[PDB]
Each structure stands twice: as C-alpha cells, then as structure tokens.
Amino acid sequence: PAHLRLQPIYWSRDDVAQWLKWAENEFSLSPIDSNTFEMNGKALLLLTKEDFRYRSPHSGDELYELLQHILELQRKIMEVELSVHGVTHQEAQTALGATGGDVVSAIRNLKVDQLFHLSSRSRADAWRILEHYQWDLSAASRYV
Q1: Of all helices (H) and strands (E), which one includes residue 73?
Q2: Which of 139, 134, 79 is nearest to 107 (CA)?
Q3: Superfamily of domain 2-74
Q4: Which of 11, 13, 24, 47 can bridge 51 by disulfide, Cβ–Cβ 3.0-4.6 Å?
Q5: Are the CB atoms for 70 and 5 separated by under 8 Å?
Q6: How many CB atoms lie under 10 A from the CB of residue 9?
Q7: Orientation of helix 103-118 relative to helix 123-132, angle to 10°
Q8: What's the CA angle centered on 136, arms 134 and 137, to 5 degrees?
C-alpha cells in the first residue's frame, strides 16, 4: 500500500485514509467512509478495540486486529512519551526495551533520569523526591 510501508506511528491523516481503503479492498470489508477515523497514526494507536467497533460496527474489530498484526510496542512507546516530558521515540523504545516491556517501570526510570538531569543531588535522592511527590515530575521538578 505504498506510503503505508512506514511504522503506524508515522502515519499522517491521509495515510490512515489510504490504509482504510486498502483494508476495505484487501479484506472485502463493508464500506468504510473516510469521514470516520479522522486522525493520524499516533491517534489510531490510542483507540481501544471498543472504539474501533463504535466507529466501524461492520469492520472495526477487523481493522484493530489488522493494526495489531502490523504494529504492540508502538502503543507503549506512545504511553511513555505521553507520560514524561519531551521524550524521543528512540528513548522510550530504549527505556522499554530495558524495562522488559513494563511501561510503569519505564516511565519511572525516565522520570528519575529526567529529574536527575536537573538536580545536583544523588540519584537515590531523585528517586526519593520523585516518589515523595507520587511520581509527579512537575512537583518534584520545581523543588530544584
């Protein structure tokens, strides 16, 4: 499907629209109006399967599984980058790859790193400060 050869996290809005049409014809789906799913590939990853069904009762579950067969870890990278301030894709991917897939540990260790960067304190102090403020990098960031 041409431009669809890139990771779904990089899909623009029109890539999503062309992915829908491609799925409809490749899988003989019921008509999928392009007006639905008016979003880019980053947004598609945040939708639940239930959201796919509400948008496409005829094909929603199929589209969601087809996106799962295409691309899993991308949702996690998104969650990490959405939980910590200004994290790159490769950073979230690197952090999760160390976390073993644990998004919770991955966000914490990145917040601990991000706090440590702004603080002259020990890294064990950063972990205590961030935990004292319930892993709220903003409220543990103003302290410095």
Answers
A1: helix 73-83
A2: 79
A3: Transcription Factor, Ets-1 (1.10.150.50)
A4: 47
A5: no
A6: 18
A7: 120
A8: 135
For 113-134, letters b (16+ CB in 10 Å) and e give ebbbeebeeeeeebbebbeebe
Q: Are 51 and 37 in contact (CB under 8 A)?
A: no
Beta-carbon contacts of residue 59 (< 8 Å; ≥ 6 apart): 23, 24, 27, 29, 30, 32
The shares of helix, strand and coil residues in the chain, as percent rounded to the nearest 5, are 65, 0, 35
The span from the CA of 81 to the CA of 90, in Å, is 10
Annotated resolution, angstroms: 2.1
